[PDB]
């Protein structure tokens, strides 16, 4: 009973490692999208006038 409940804690900590390492993939790619459409200031500043 202390080995059955000592390995079910392994797989949930490998399931919590599953989802809460995928939530980076939102924060990774959305930051990566904004950088793909990122002109710098010394380009955009005169065009904005």
């Amino acid at each position: 009973f202390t080995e059955y409940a000592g390995a079910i804690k392994t797989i949930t900590s490998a399931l919590q490692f599953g989802m809460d390492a995928l939530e980076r993939g939102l924060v990774d790619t959305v930051l990566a999208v904004k950088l793909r459409h990122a002109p710098p200031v010394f380009i955009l500043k005169t065009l904005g006038d």
Partner: protein, 49 residues
């Protein structure tokens, strides 16, 4: 002829719990050092990706 001497007090220093050095060290008082050989602390760090 009985005489009487002049002795000053030992300059007292109050124990360091009134000093702010207690911030640098949590202080658990310990009962037998001749009984402990090598105490230890173990860390276990799970690391997401």
């Amino acid at each position: 002829e009985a005489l009487l001497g002049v002795y000053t007090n030992v300059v007292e220093f109050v124990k360091f719990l009134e000093t702010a050095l207690a911030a640098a060290c949590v202080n658990t008082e310990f009962k037998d050092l001749r009984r402990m050989i090598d105490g230890k602390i173990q860390f276990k760090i799970s690391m997401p990706t």
